[PDB]
Design a protein around this ligand. Structure first.
Ligand SMILES: Nc1ncnc2c1ncn2[C@@H]1O[C@H](COP(=O)(O)O[C@H]2[C@@H](O)[C@H](n3cnc4c(N)ncnc43)O[C@@H]2COP(=O)(O)OP(=O)(O)OP(=O)(O)O)[C@@H](O)[C@H]1O
Ligand code: MG
Ligand code: MG
Lengths: 214, 252, 138, 297, 214, 207, 138
């Protein structure tokens, strides 16, 4: 059995995820955001979402401290995100996906594009001279509908898996996703968190929703 | 019985060079007697038969010798045993004959069901390729003092040339046992890009640049540049020593 | 993809060389003031022109649309208006525009209306700024 | 006289006793077997046997040719007139084929021993690992000994007085291959009858010693005459009869022992076409007529 | 008799299906994908698709557990994908083929390339220092037309064989197709599935075509 | 009385025929392909094509219901039913080097594969040398006109075997994606003799 | 092959040796600034050169046309424009761009208009960065 965790990621502040492939002009942008190559639609890579969620959850579950290596995290994190250790390989019960922004029509109703330009600078404390940059940033109010695949392997510890999934989601809500988060950017929110059966039906699927929506 | 190695069957065909000439004119005319000729003949025969038996029985060798007799040698056994007994055979022959008679060999790798007649024929033509060795094509007759290592075209020697190849093999075995166990994937890269250098040279200098680029905390770049230093002067020597090292250390 | 700088068509590969030619020609033979003086266009003014081009380029580039919409063309016509205003205010800026075909380039983009035409125009202006920084210095 | 040059477009298997090894040349009994099979194909085996048994078409075996250097197996000279100098030893032992124009030079001495062997390079023997795939049983790995020639290299056959029927048979033999695994992808060649001028002088020459150029067996009458001051070598010519219309099963033939194609004689004998299959329902023949090259020591 | 199963693999997210080295620079593409060597088109190996599909089907034909060798999984899996067990050799009914990019022209309609370079990195936790990595991925929206040959050893198992084939295609929907799938990549979809007879006219190919196309 | 059947084999998905055990490294090509002994160009051995075509025809003309057709077309020597041959397959050399060199690309590729353990979930990277797709192999097959009546059935069976090869593979790990091929330029022209019905034999292969 | 540099010629076989020679010339006698020097270029300034070259290398590494397309040529010209621009910003970069004749190689690539020429140029630049590594650091 396999389950699909749907939901939406709503940007609270501007969100920047780096990665640059071509044509950064000399007066326009210095750090573009990652975009879907075909449709040019900005996206949240599943790698970055998975990594931030794993970091926050592993730090929270262990002791509040996290200095180890990913293949030596706690057993919940190891069983939910995977482990490549030689003799102890845990197959990941989560398959994150790349997350394109869904409410572009809603944004176009407000006569705005999905990305803004943010003008920053650093001020040399010696001479008080400013060095300007130009960060492309996905505007607040953008919504990213996602889908995370959960491989239902153990029928009994699925509840603890989903409690930790919700805990990691809530840790992201009080943190940033991608880019210069401590300097204002990156704030996000989660909504419409619902798990559904990929094929067939699961006995505790009404329980797994109420431990996701609450 | 091996744990790390290859599943190939190695054979040896050692033939003393110019023994017939050593009988026709090798012994001095002034010192020509029936007793002296008989002494030389019996010494050579006893050497071959008896001392091959005793040298193999001295310690644990995985060899199943087929024929010793006289002036010839056939052996079948573990591949690494053939390789490390070829040197023992050459040094023992040099010691017993006082570096007067040259010897040639030939080694071939075969499967567990390869035709043994084909084994013998291929090892014989490799032996001939070792017999017809000449560093330069100016002097009359061949030196005959060479060994072919798995190929008729790969005619190496027993002299300072084999000394160099074995020093390289020992150095590579000592050095390249303990890498980062991840950056070792460049070894097949080097092997398949040095398989023959008469073609696009761009990738060779590119790998040189990559080896220079590789920079972390390791043994350093002493041997990492010794690879480059040995990658130009000794091309066939490097590929042969590297392939011997790979076959010895292959996790098969 | 075929701009019409002056009397010579500009393609998508000679923008850098032609912008270099424009900057060197201005640098070698510069504008002469009314009051018997010599001066160039400041880096601030050309940087403002590039910013103007950067305002529209930053929204054009994040698209796959072959032809620019009416809003982009409206912004381009406005940038042409501001070019005319800058030319009318400081005669050195008018000279800089006239020695290049920056007005003629913007008119060619306005007449072509395609995204690739404005992309080449942005490339040309970026190269003009690049060769000002390289040759004029700072 | 009439050098038949065979140019092969695929590696050949000319096996001697087993499939795992191949040899570089085929003999004259192999070629006569192939031509007799062709003649049975187009229904004139009787005329071909009459021609070959009446010496109207007598041929040597296949010798190598490299870049218009016609080669011959090292003649079995008694070497009684060379012990004064040169190397009367294993130096002239790895030498397998000498050129046929330089034979009198070799016979009188002065041909380089080392130089020829590296000069003599026509392709190389090859392994060909094959199997019999079985759906549920285990597959049967076997290998076929093959041999590929160089670009400007092949085999050449000496024929005296070429025949229209022989020309017709050699056209048919192009498309049926020659050698071991010919119905597999191995036997394949094209030929040129290629009359030659510097070669017919060698066979119009004279001399005391005669070089046998085809694996031949003397008649019972002239064996005593031929076996006098002769330096020969026997070879068994047997195997399995290759025909689907013989003995209703896979039966071997009477092994025949013939003088090799490098032997030397003082008395010229004319060999015979030998009945080696008698218990079957067609005459299996072993072409063992004699083809000579007279020289003078 | 031989049947040909046609379809399209459409990339929902970027796919990193490759492992071939093609003279890559230090920081250009740290992980390239497998391509057709002559046409440079991106390629889905038939071995990769076959292996992932066999894994998913063999696990989902137990269900949920798969710890055995490929030759001990299941009669259905062995008869569909092949067994080399010495006692009972089984001939595979499915002949997978390497799949090339089909809609390169449709990609050029959007002035986009066939692949992309996705910049990732790794954050150490005892030192908080990143470590980049650039992996090549075929663009989401790429389409791969495939033909998989199926041979009828008996027509009393063809209906269940196509049940299992459609099931494996469905299980590939909720998994990835080889690569960094757990971290966003590899999500695919199956479209325009059909089965046709290579030579002849199979009597009941309408049931097979209605069960493949659902 | 002798027919030659020309045609070209086009590699569609890359082909790995044969194993020549030599010159292996740690990475290596764990399984190389068959090549010419001298030119080292890859080839399709006539035995491989002949055997795979015979397999396809035998499993086709029988369907679990060899036959006279397969034995007369490929030969037989089993115990009593010795039939000689009509088809004489040849080794097929790589024709596309002039074309393959214009792409600055080699005639062979190294395909990287792995097997993943189902218990320990541990991979194992194997390398398979493979002849790249788009390679062409012009071939020739010699057919002997032993009987003039059976020619149409024999050539129908030859075309059927080619067609069966079209929906199959030719060498190596085919079910894992490799070894798909195609045929074109399929013509038969008499080489020795004169067959008046060569037109319908070309129409058999042309179809 | 046939990549002109200004004083010599780097063919497809001779990019790494020239790159190491140029890096040694850079490592020897460092740059002289207003204050007598003397600091050397940073790893994250040859970075920019390396990603600039890779942004076309990634698009040319996977193709089979002998001559570069008009889109690739435009991006190479844009690389030339960018390297001209950034050299005017910092002098420690301009000496790197001059002592290692980037501009001549780019211009020859734009003149040859062939895939192999740009591959050789990219190999030369990559070897240059690789050789800056293992000599300096930081
Ligand atoms: N006492 C004596 N014995 C043998 N031959 C003698 C003697 N005095 C003179 N001669 C002459 O030498 C040659 C020998 O040629 P050959 O008859 O081919 O005989 C073989 C072999 O029987 C003989 N042999 C081998 N081992 C011994 C020993 N232990 N003692 C005596 N004799 C022995 O030598 C010949 C071996 O042939 P090859 O191995 O091929 O020679 P090579 O050294 O390998 O040459 P190369 O390939 O390196 O160039 C006759 O003329 C005889 O009258
Ligand atoms: Mg000897
Ligand atoms: Mg001997």
């Amino acid at each position: 059995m396999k389950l699909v965790i749907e939901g939406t990621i709503v940007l609270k502040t501007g969100m920047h995820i780096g990665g640059s492939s071509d044509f950064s002009a000399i007066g326009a942008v210095d750090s573009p955001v990652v975009r879907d190559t075909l449709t040019r639609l900005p996206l949240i890579p599943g790698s970055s979402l998975k990594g931030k969620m794993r970091y926050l959850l592993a730090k929270e579950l262990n002791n509040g401290i996290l200095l180890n290596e990913p293949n030596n995290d706690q057993d919940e994190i190891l069983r939910l995100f995977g482990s490549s250790e030689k003799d102890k390989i845990r197959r990941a019960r989560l398959k994150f996906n790349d997350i394109k922004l869904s409410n572009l029509a809603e944004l176009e109703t407000f006569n705005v594009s999905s990305t803004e330009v943010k003008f920053e600078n650093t001020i040399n404390r010696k001479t008080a001279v400013a060095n300007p940059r130009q960060i492309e940033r996905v505007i607040a109010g953008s919504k990213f509908d996602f889908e995370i695949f959960y491989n239902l392997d153990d029928i009994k510890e699925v509840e603890k898996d989903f409690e930790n999934i919700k805990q990691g989601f809530d840790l992201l809500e009080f943190d940033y996703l991608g880019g210069h988060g401590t300097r204002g950017s990156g704030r996000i929110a989660f909504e419409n968190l619902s798990v559904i059966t990929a094929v067939g039906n699961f006995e505790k699927i009404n329980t797994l929703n109420e431990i996701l929506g609450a | 019985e091996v744990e790390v190695g290859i599943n190939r069957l190695g054979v040896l065909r050692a033939d003393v060079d110019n023994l017939g000439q050593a009988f026709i004119n090798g012994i001095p005319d002034d010192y020509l007697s029936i007793s002296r000729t008989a002494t030389f003949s019996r010494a050579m025969s006893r050497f071959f038969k008896n001392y091959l038996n005793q040298l193999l029985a001295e310690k644990s060798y995985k060899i199943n010798v087929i024929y010793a007799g006289g002036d010839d040698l056939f052996m079948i056994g573990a591949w690494q045993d053939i390789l490390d007994f070829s040197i023992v055979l050459k040094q023992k022959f040099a010691d017993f004959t006082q570096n007067k008679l040259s010897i040639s060999a030939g080694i071939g790798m075969f499967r567990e069901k390869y035709p043994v007649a084909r084994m013998a024929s291929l090892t014989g033509d490799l032996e001939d390729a070792a017999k017809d060795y000449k560093p330069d094509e100016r002097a009359v007759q061949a030196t005959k003092n060479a060994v072919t290592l798995f190929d008729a075209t790969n005619v190496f020697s027993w002299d300072t040339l084999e000394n160099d190849i074995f020093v390289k093999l020992d150095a590579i075995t000592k050095n390249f046992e303990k890498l980062d166990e991840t950056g070792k994937a460049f070894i097949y890269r080097l092997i398949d890009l040095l398989r023959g250098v008469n073609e696009n040279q761009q990738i060779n200098i590119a790998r040189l640049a990559y080896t220079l680029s590789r920079m972390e905390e390791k043994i350093g770049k002493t041997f990492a540049q010794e690879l480059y230093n040995w990658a130009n002067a000794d091309r066939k020597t490097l590929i042969m020593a590297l392939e011997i090292y790979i076959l010895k250390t292959r996790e098969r | 993809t075929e701009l019409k700088i002056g009397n010579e068509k500009v393609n998508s590969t000679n923008f850098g060389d032609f912008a270099e030619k424009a900057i060197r020609g201005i640098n070698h033979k510069p504008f002469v003031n009314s009051k018997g003086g010599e001066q160039k266009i400041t880096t601030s003014k050309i940087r403002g022109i590039l910013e103007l081009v950067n305002k529209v380029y930053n929204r054009v580039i994040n698209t796959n649309d072959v032809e620019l919409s009416e809003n982009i063309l409206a912004d381009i016509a406005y940038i042409k208006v501001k070019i005319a205003y800058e030319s009318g205010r400081e005669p050195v800026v008018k000279d800089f525009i006239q020695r290049t075909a920056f007005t003629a380039a913007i008119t060619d983009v306005m007449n072509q209306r395609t995204r690739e035409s404005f992309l080449l125009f942005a490339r040309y202006v970026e190269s003009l700024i690049a060769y000002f920084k390289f040759y004029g210095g700072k | 006289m009439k050098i038949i040059k065979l140019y092969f477009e695929s590696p050949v298997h000319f096996g001697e006793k087993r499939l795992s090894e191949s040899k570089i040349t085929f003999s004259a009994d192999t070629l006569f077997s192939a031509l007799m099979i062709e003649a049975v194909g187009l229904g004139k085996e009787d005329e071909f046997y009459q021609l070959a048994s009446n010496n109207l078409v007598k041929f040597s075996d296949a010798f190598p040719f490299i870049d218009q250097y016609y080669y011959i197996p090292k003649p079995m000279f008694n070497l009684k007139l060379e012990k004064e100098d040169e190397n009367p030893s294993k130096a002239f032992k790895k030498l397998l084929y000498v050129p046929i124009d330089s034979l009198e030079d070799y016979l009188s001495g002065g041909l380089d021993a080392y130089f020829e062997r590296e000069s003599f390079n026509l392709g190389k023997l090859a392994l060909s690992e094959k199997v019999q795939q079985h759906d549920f049983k285990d597959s049967e790995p076997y290998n076929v000994g093959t041999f590929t020639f160089k670009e400007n290299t092949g085999l050449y056959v000496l024929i005296e007085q070429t025949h229209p029927l022989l020309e017709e048979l050699l056209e048919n033999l192009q498309y049926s291959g020659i050698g071991g695994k010919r119905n597999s992808g191995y036997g394949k060649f094209k030929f040129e009858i290629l009359e030659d001028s510097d070669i017919e002088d060698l066979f119009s020459a004279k001399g005391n010693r005669k070089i046998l150029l085809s694996g031949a067996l003397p008649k019972d009458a002239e064996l005593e005459q031929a076996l006098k001051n002769a330096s020969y070598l026997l070879e068994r010519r047997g195997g399995f009869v290759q025909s689907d219309t013989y003995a209703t099963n896979l039966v071997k033939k009477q092994d025949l022992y013939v003088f090799k194609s490098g032997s030397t004689f003082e008395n010229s004998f004319d060999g015979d076409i030998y009945q080696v299959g008698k218990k079957g329902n067609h005459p299996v023949y072993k072409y063992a007529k004699s083809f000579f090259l007279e020289v003078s020591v």
